[PDB]
A paper describes a structure:
We observed increased sensitivity to SB of CsPYL15m with respect to [name] WT as [name] IC50 of SB was 12-fold lower for [name] synthetic receptor. [name] comparison of [name] and CsPYL5m binding pockets reveals that CsPYL15m displays a closer interaction with SB at mutated Leu112, whose methyl groups show favorable contacts with [name] SB’s aromatic bicyclic ring (middle and right). In addition, an enlargement of [name] binding pocket at Ile137 is observed (right). This free space is filled with water molecules that interact with [name] polar side chain of Lys88, which is otherwise buried in a more hydrophobic environment in [name] WT receptor bound to SB (right). Thus, Lys88 of CsPYL15m is more amenable to polar interactions in [name] pocket of CsPYL15m bound to SB. Together, these structural insights may explain [name] enhanced sensitivity of CsPYL15m to SB. Both [name]-SB-[name] and CsPYL15m-SB-[name] complexes lack such interaction of [name] agonist with [name] conserved Lys88 residue of [name] receptor; rather, [name] structures show that [name] hydrophobic CH2 of [name] SB linker faces a water-filled cavity harboring [name] side-chain NH3+ of Lys88 (middle and right).
Specifically, both gate and latch loops define a surface that enables [name] receptor to dock into [name] PP2C active site. [name] formation of receptor-[name]-phosphatase complexes causes [name] dissociation of different PP2C-SnRK2 complexes and abolishes PP2C-mediated inhibition of [name] SnRK2s, triggering [name] response.
Numbering used by the authors:
A (entry chain B): 186 to 225, 227 to 273, 278 to 310, 314 to 507
B (entry chain A): 20 to 209
The structure:
Amino acid sequence: CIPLWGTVSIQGNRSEMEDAFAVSPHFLKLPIKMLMGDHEESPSLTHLTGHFFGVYDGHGGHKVADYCRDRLHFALAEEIERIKDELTGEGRQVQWDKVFTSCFLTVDGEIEGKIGRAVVDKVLEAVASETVGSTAVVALVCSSHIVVSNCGDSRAVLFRGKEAMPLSVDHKPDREDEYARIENAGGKVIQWQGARVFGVLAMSRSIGDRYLKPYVIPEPEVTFMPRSREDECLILASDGLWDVMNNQEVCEIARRRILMWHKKNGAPPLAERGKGIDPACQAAADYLSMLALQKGSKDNISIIVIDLKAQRKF
Amino acid sequence: RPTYTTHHLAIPSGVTQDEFDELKQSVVEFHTYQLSQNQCSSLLAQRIRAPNDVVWSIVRRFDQPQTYKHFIKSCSVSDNFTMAVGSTRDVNLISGLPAATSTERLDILDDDRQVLGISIIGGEHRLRNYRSVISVHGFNRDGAICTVALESYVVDVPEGNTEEDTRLFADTVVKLNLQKLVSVAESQVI
Ligand SMILES: Cc1cc(=O)n(C)c2ccc(S(=O)(=O)NCc3ccccc3)cc12
Ligand SMILES: [Cl-]
Ligand SMILES: [Cl-]
Ligand SMILES: [Cl-]
Ligand SMILES: [Cl-]
Ligand SMILES: [Mn+2]
Ligand SMILES: [Mn+2]
Ligand SMILES: [Mn+2]
Ligand SMILES: [Mn+2]
């Protein structure tokens, strides 16, 4: 499972950069039991290497998105470690949503100054003002599965065969279920330059945003996706991209740009692959970001393109 | 003839009936607006465990709203700013809001009564013709000293929205700022 990825993260027309992202290849040794069981004989198989990808679209400031970039994948590894020191198909799905929910809630509480943070003891102190928050869309990729955890309106989209498949659903306050959840919790949603919690925040879930607890919650939606030979690419991006471009078109453009690079340049020597960005993926991320600006996106724009094909021959 | 707000007819949330028997008079004095067509108006109150001189010293700093309000990235005043009535400030708001900037004029700065009044005269936002007044009121509760801040506003209802929408949004922001003022004022008093 050689990690093939490329990234662009631009400020664009905005006065501040509040997008952040993290890529940590070979970051985790995922216990093989969290992905699959045994079946008729791979005794050497004890774990699979997990690659971490995250995009964090900050709002009200940059410090929460930056904290997610620096912290969130370590909070995830800590959750998985608690499972290695404490150790079914349907069970795997529930296990992964518990792991990611605990991770997202831990980071949210650290940000709010309510959970102690490690001090090279633990310190209780808000990372940012109570009006600062961030989306988080995170993907764990291994040879057998993709796990996506999403909180907010950044998005992960899997291109499988010829179909773009969103692996997250935007947490917007006018989503039927999110609207009901907010009002059931005592909150209000107002159309005020778009659907907004109390007219202020155009998002129903986020990391941070202490002032809108418990209407704006950090609980993510988690997707446990078996991989398929038909998988082409996985795209994580902030809404600086999705606000001007369609899911299907983004995936298809990324695939076509990856193939164009390979047709013109051949593949890199496999000894060099997986160390840094993949040039084909980088070309796709570059092209998508320039299209988004050409289409008039006035936002920060952050894109991770991940090639899911082992090889691409013509 | 012209219509006027009637915030003196109801005790605002967070005030006691005893407190309101005094504060009612202040609502008439400082928190009564002549209403224009399609406008919205609200009166909010916030109790503060600090002496009214401490609260006022914070509130009166028209050039430094970020010290006791949320949502502000930066605030600039004139090079020769002297805090006279008629001063203006240009405020840049943090991201993610249904607003980006605000230009505001200082209309009342009464150190003798501890009343601050501001009118929004520009910016990128949907609270057109917003005018507000905050007044500070000290109480001596048999040795125990506290303050009640009263803050009201009048604003146009933007096209496409209702008065209920507008009050919900404006009240939310005012209430949040009043909660910061509590924290800032109480942290200066033992
Ligand atoms: C004008 C305005 C509109 C808007 O929708 N919002 C979110 C604001 C947020 C803050 C401010 S500000 O702090 O510059 N003045 C203090 C203040 C606070 C609240 C309402 C008016 C003025 C102004 C606005
Ligand atoms: Cl901006
Ligand atoms: Cl910040
Ligand atoms: Cl193309
Ligand atoms: Cl290309
Ligand atoms: Mn943002
Ligand atoms: Mn939160
Ligand atoms: Mn958007
Ligand atoms: Mn954005």
